[PDB]
Design a protein around this ligand. Structure first.
Ligand SMILES: CC(C)CCC[C@@H](C)[C@H]1CC[C@H]2[C@@H]3CC=C4C[C@@H](O)CC[C@]4(C)[C@H]3CC[C@]12C
Ligand SMILES: CC(C)CCC[C@@H](C)[C@H]1CC[C@H]2[C@@H]3CC=C4C[C@@H](O)CC[C@]4(C)[C@H]3CC[C@]12C
Ligand SMILES: CC(C)CCC[C@@H](C)[C@H]1CC[C@H]2[C@@H]3CC=C4C[C@@H](O)CC[C@]4(C)[C@H]3CC[C@]12C
Lengths: 329, 216, 288, 53
């Protein structure tokens, strides 16, 4: 294990000062109030994933009832109703251009639907087939390129026009559960069921860096707004922030009171406030810098499975298994 | 406000469509198929009318059933088995002639224990199917079964071996009040198997109706 | 045979006041329990909510009776029509919704596959509206020809109708109370008991036992009212030989009303000790 | 083992990438957070006049 010691020595050599010590000078944010501005109703099954829109008004959510509907957050109503061939959906994505929507699940195929591009109707555009495992996550790289993570330990990048895999990332060891897209649209990081979360390169298609530290399977991951860092949500009741430059867990977010795992992790517009959707019927709100609790979100009856933050930070949408979506702030 | 009114009425109509679709889905019966290495015993029926998950639809006694096989899912079970919460019953298939083959019976019992004691299917019942009975008839004669269980202490006949296997599988429940395990032996004809499935589904529906009230 | 009224008006008014308090508290607790969480409500839950609403109608119409008893002010014919309408529509809604609960349990237990296959079973809201409309329609003749005469509002029927209208009304209400609903509930619960014993679910069929106990309590506490209604029907049909009935009928009606209001107040008290989750909800509510 | 040999080359790329001090990365993250702090409706509450929720 000569290479194992070399990377460990480099991390120790680059370790100079922890984030907690540096954040002593800055003023803690303190406790802040979370209130449900509005609630989205109509789902009849557990909600597993949702994605915010670039327009900051339209959001799409996935539920186990076989419907992938799009919510209008401003006026609190639904705009589209997309039936799903397979009712087992565990992930969904919304195109940045807003003309496309994706959804994965246990069907091992990622479906693409036209969001009323023509004729004022919704129809299936492309069905990305070629994954031997359940689609744990999927994200639209571009209007034509989409990167998805499956249950077969491998992540693949798909092109809508060709319908095939432009590149495939097989460097993982455990079952991949979620992925996030960097703001520059050039890198993406995915967490797996093992203890290692590794960054991926879109153009290179190879594992540039690998991050360890978690004691259990990682369920959620999200890039920091700057794009040089990201946070991982595992089942060990610990949220760890990883920096693409330091190559170490510069900040850990674990509280003794909350021993439950983490299902969804999302960052605010500035990134100072980090929201993690726990499965104790609540969604704890943390601070990226102070590494302490900043708010309590206990407006859900069932375990929170998905959590999304608007691009401009206008509102935060939290989904849970109670088939209810609530918009915060 | 014509655009707002049009959006509101479209939202209401699609909401009512979603509600009626959800009601229609609730009118159906959802069943989960499980097994270490045994599958296809229930899917080989002629009543069926309709990739990691295979959905099979068959109507028996004017009741619609939906089966979901998970054999193609080779990933971690705990990461996706929660999506199957709410199914009426779970069909578990065990081969009676798996004790001699390799440890296979031990793996099947371990899988059954993991599924039953997973704190996610406590309310849902489990339907147990014991297949390969015809081959087991000669397997129990050829294989004394004493090697599989050092403390078996029973007759080397098909009936006693089947009873011991059923008792061992039932002993892994540890939750008798919340759920009830229905054990059946696969027959040559599929009519008996489908009748047992229908009876177990009806019993589960009756049990759910007993607790449907949110005030009693 | 001979009966003498020895019920103090002040004590009876205090009894109605405490019945009002108990019934209001119980109905509020029941309605809150059936609308506490955001999860979808079962059809039996909305049926119990409708029953609680009928009990609320009873506790809202008894203040008029108290006003007659002690206040003796504002006793107009319109207000008598109002209170009689509320009381009878509440009684008819209660009996009809109990029958609907019995039928729903019969479908859920005996014809479970058929009940699940049918789509109208889940549509309990339209069933509730239909039941309320039927109860209102069947109670409409019960109060639309009443007026006040000598500090007691009853009768005042047209001369042509008075020959047959009161006896027809009495026999119709007695029938719609304890003839068709009684047989329907008895058959439904008999089938449910047979199915539970055959399928060996009796050890966990606590809800069925609770509903059966509630139905039995309702029937036992509403039996005297229908018995005296039948006696009145026989008296109008000159089939009753005894003459003291014409004097004791007022006391019989009063005591039947008292026992009916007692049943109304204790209807949701049964859900407390017999309902484990209702008792658990009360502990959670008392904490706030 | 073919898999073991392939994994050796994968670890070489991860070990050979440039790594900077964790303090500098933390300082950069904090600076970015303060830079966009005034533009974060979650961190800084927004009046209901400009709030569309
Ligand atoms: C003299 C009469 C006509 C006036 C008063 C009638 C009142 C007590 C009755 C008539 C119809 C009833 C409604 C009919 C159906 C529903 C839907 C159900 O899910 C909840 C109760 C609700 C909302 C009922 C509440 C009480 C109700 C409004
Ligand atoms: C004569 C006595 C025993 C009758 C008591 C029960 C009555 C009130 C109940 C039993 C079943 C009920 C019906 C069941 C089904 C529906 C379909 C629905 O879409 C409208 C209402 C309607 C038509 C209900 C109206 C009232 C109803 C007929
Ligand atoms: C229309 C006619 C034919 C209906 C006849 C009603 C009879 C058969 C039904 C109505 C309610 C039923 C009872 C309800 C409760 C129980 C308690 C249970 O532990 C034993 C049976 C027993 C005692 C049932 C026996 C039969 C029963 C009395």
């Amino acid at each position: 294990e000569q290479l194992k010691n070399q990377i460990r020595d480099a991390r120790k050599a680059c370790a100079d000062a922890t984030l907690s010590q540096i954040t002593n000078n800055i003023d803690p944010v303190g406790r802040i109030q979370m209130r449900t501005r509005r609630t989205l109703r109509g789902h009849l099954a557990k909600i597993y994933a949702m994605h915010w829109g670039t327009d900051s008004r339209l959001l799409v959510s996935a539920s186990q009832d076989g419907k992938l509907i799009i919510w209008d957050s401003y006026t609190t109503n639904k705009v589209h109703a997309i039936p799903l061939r397979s009712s087992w959906v565990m992930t969904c994505a919304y195109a940045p251009s807003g003309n496309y929507v994706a959804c994965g699940g246990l069907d091992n195929i990622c479906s693409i639907y036209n969001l009323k591009t023509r004729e004022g109707n919704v129809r299936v555009s492309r069905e990305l087939a070629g994954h031997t495992g359940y689609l744990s996550c999927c994200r639209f790289l571009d209007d034509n390129q989409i990167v998805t993570s499956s249950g077969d330990t491998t992540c693949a990048l798909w092109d809508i026009e060709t319908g095939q895999q432009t590149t495939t990332f097989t460097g993982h060891t455990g079952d991949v559960m979620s992925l996030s897209l960097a703001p520059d649209t050039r890198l993406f990081v995915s967490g797996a069921c093992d203890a290692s979360a590794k960054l991926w390169d879109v153009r290179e298609g190879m594992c540039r860096q690998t991050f360890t530290g978690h004691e259990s399977d990682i369920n959620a991951i999200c890039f920091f707004p700057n794009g040089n860092a990201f946070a991982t949500g595992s089942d060990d009741a610990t949220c760890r922030l990883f920096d693409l430059r330091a190559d170490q867990e510069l900040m850990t977010y674990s509280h003794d009171n909350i021993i439950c795992g983490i299902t969804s992790v999302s960052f605010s517009k500035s990134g100072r406030l980090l929201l993690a959707g726990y499965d104790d019927f609540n969604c704890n709100v943390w601070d990226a810098l102070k590494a302490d609790r900043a708010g309590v979100l206990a407006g859900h009856d069932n375990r929170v499975s998905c959590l999304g933050v608007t691009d401009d930070g206008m509102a935060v949408a939290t989904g849970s298994w109670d088939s209810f979506l609530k918009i915060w702030n | 406000s014509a655009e707002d009114k049009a959006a509101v009425e479209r939202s209401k109509m699609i909401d009512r469509n979603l509600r009626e679709d959800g009601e229609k889905a609730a009118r159906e019966v959802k069943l989960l198929l499980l097994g270490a290495g045994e599958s296809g015993k229930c899917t080989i029926v002629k009543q069926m009318k309709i990739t990691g998950i295979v959905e099979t639809h068959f109507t028996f006694k004017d009741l619609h059933f939906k089966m979901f096989d998970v054999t193609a899912q080779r990933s971690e079970r705990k990461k996706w088995i929660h999506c199957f919460e709410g199914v009426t019953a779970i069909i578990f298939c065990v081969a009676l002639s798996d004790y001699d083959l390799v440890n296979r019976m031990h793996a099947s019992m371990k899988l059954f224990d993991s599924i039953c004691n997973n704190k996610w299917f406590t309310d849902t019942s489990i339907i147990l199917f014991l297949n390969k009975k015809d081959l087991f008839e000669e397997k129990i004669k050829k294989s004394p079964l004493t090697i599989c269980y050092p403390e078996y202490a029973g007759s080397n006949t098909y009936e006693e071996a089947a009873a011991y296997i059923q008792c061992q599988f039932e002993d892994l429940n540890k939750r008798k009040d919340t759920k009830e395990i229905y054990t059946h032996f696969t027959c040559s004809t599929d009519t008996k198997n489908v009748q047992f499935v229908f009876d177990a589904v009806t019993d589960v529906i009756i049990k759910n109706n007993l607790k449907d009230c949110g005030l009693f | 045979i001979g009966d003498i009224v020895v019920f103090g008006t002040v004590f009876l008014s205090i009894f109605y006041s405490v019945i009002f308090a108990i019934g209001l508290v119980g109905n509020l607790l029941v309605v809150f329990a059936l609308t506490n969480s955001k999860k979808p409500k079962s059809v039996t839950d909305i049926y119990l909510l409708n029953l609680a609403l009928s009990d609320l109608l009873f506790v809202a119409t008894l203040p008029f009776w108290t006003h007659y008893l002690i206040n003796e002010k504002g006793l107009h014919n319109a207000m008598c029509k109002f209170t009689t309408a509320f009381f009878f529509i509440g009684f008819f809604g209660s009996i009809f919704f109990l029958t609907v609960i019995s039928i729903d349990r019969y479908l859920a237990i005996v014809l479970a596959a058929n009940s699940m296959n049918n789509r109208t079973v889940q549509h309990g809201v339209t069933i509730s509206l239909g039941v309320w409309a039927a109860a209102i329609l069947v109670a409409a003749p019960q109060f639309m020809f009443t007026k006040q005469k000598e500090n007691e509002c009853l009768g005042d029927y047209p001369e042509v109708l008075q020959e047959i209208w009161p006896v027809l009304r009495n026999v119709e209400t007695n029938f719609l109370g304890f003839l068709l609903p009684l047989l329907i509930m008895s058959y439904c619960y008999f089938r449910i008991i047979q199915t539970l014993f055959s399928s060996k679910n009796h050890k966990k069929a606590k809800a069925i036992k609770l509903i059966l106990l509630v139905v039995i309590v309702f029937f036992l506490f509403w039996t005297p009212y229908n018995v005296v209604i039948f006696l009145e029907t026989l008296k109008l049909y000159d089939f009753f030989p005894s003459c003291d009935m014409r004097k004791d009928l007022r006391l019989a009606l009063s005591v039947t009303e008292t026992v009916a209001f007692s049943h109304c107040c204790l209807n949701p008290l049964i859900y407390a000790f017999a309902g484990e989750k209702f008792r658990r909800y009360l502990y959670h509510l008392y904490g706030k | 083992i073919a898999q073991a040999r392939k994994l050796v080359e994968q670890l070489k790329m991860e070990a050979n990438i440039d790594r900077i001090k964790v303090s500098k990365a933390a300082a950069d993250l904090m600076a970015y957070c303060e830079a966009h702090a005034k533009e974060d409706p979650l961190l800084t509450p927004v009046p209901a006049s400009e709030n569309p929720f």
